Amino acid sequence: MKTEWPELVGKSVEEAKKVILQDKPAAQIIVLPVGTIVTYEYRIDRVRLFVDRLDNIAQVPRVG
Amino acid sequence: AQSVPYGVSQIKAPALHSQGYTGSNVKVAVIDSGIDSSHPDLKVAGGASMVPSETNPFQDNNSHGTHVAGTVAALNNSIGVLGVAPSASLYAVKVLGADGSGQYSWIINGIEWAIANNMDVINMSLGGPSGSAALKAAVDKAVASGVVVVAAAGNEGTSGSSSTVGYPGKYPSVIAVGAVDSSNQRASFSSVGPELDVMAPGVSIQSTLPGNKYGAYNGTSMASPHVAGAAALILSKHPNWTNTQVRSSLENTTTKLGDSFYYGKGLINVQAAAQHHHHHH
Numbered sequence A: 001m002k003t004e005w006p007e008l009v010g011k012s013v014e015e016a017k018k019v020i021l022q023d024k025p026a027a028q029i030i031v032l033p034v035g036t037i038v039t040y041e042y043r044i045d046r047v048r049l050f051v052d053r054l055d056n057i058a059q060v061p062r063v064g
Numbered sequence B: 001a002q003s004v005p006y007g008v009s010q011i012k013a014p015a016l017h018s019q020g021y022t023g024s025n026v027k028v029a030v031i032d033s034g035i036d037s038s039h040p041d042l043k044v045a046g047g048a049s050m051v052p053s054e055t056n057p058f059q060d061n062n063s064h065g066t067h068v069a070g071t072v073a074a075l076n077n078s079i080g081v082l083g084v085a086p087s088a089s090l091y092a093v094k095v096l097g098a099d100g101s102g103q104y105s106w107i108i109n110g111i112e113w114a115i116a117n118n119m120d121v122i123n124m125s126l127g128g129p130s131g132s133a134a135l136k137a138a139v140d141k142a143v144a145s146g147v148v149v150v151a152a153a154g155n156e157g158t159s160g161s162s163s164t165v166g167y168p169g170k171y172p173s174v175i176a177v178g179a180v181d182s183s184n185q186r187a188s189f190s191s192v193g194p195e196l197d198v199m200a201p202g203v204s205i206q207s208t209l210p211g212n213k214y215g216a217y218n219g220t221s222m223a224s225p226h227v228a229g230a231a232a233l234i235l236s237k238h239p240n241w242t243n244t245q246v247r248s249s250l251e252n253t254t255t256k257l258g259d260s261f262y263y264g265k266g267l268i269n270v271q272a273a274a275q276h277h278h279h280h281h
């Protein structure tokens, strides 16, 4: 089971969503700004995508 | 009838309750997404919101702050669950919006509010992968001012020999808390590193949710409020103990588990922490 996507860092948020939904079609994807503080609960269904101000992925996406 | 979630029993909070200590008159700020003050198993004493577009700290549009609050302080009655410190004075310090995120300046503003309002304990079930000088200054200021500051370690799992503890947990002044299950095994998602201080239950933790609900959540976010609640129990039994002393009491009386890189000092034991003389069990 794929749970991290380091190959998506530096890609557009759009391509990252498409790729993650191919691997995990029921993922609950939420896009947040990189450099924010976030809740530390663990959600096996969730993938947060942290984007820079250009809307590119700025941190390795992972399940949780 | 009320149920006692396993994690409350696992840290030995019922021993303090039977001695008559429940966190009365201890002020605990839950710095988080808000707390649903209408929940019949919570009593919220006060609070403030630092989120520009969500000005009511007593409306929790995410659910996370309400769950964390119930592990700290769900009321002792005939309903719902029981908190670690069910008599604590609970403050909703809203610094995260509905989506579970906040700007560093919102978190800092909430920490400053807590210091200005004489909070005895802060719980931060939250973090980010990088620090900032201003964030470090805010937590160091709260500690210098006498506040016990507790934070979730993060859910980044392992990464070889690298620390994966988040900030502000990773700062020396903050107690960083990892997650174990009911068998004392580290949760696979629990962050690791030399900054991990103690562990508490963080798997399938039942607590309060908005709109008079209950449910089981997972995370170091769930482990942190066991330790913040334990700090409130300790202060209710020893009201003159400093934050320094409360922190050492928890660290010095854990049940040691595995290697400290993965487990820190082990599982907290609030019964042993609240005695005068401290040793590990």
Ligand SMILES: [Ca+2]
Pocket: B002, B041, B074, B075, B076, B077, B078, B079, B080, B081, B082
């Ligand atoms: Ca109750």
Ligand code: NA
Pocket: B168, B169, B170, B171, B172, B173, B174, B175, B176, B195, B197
């Ligand atoms: Na720390």
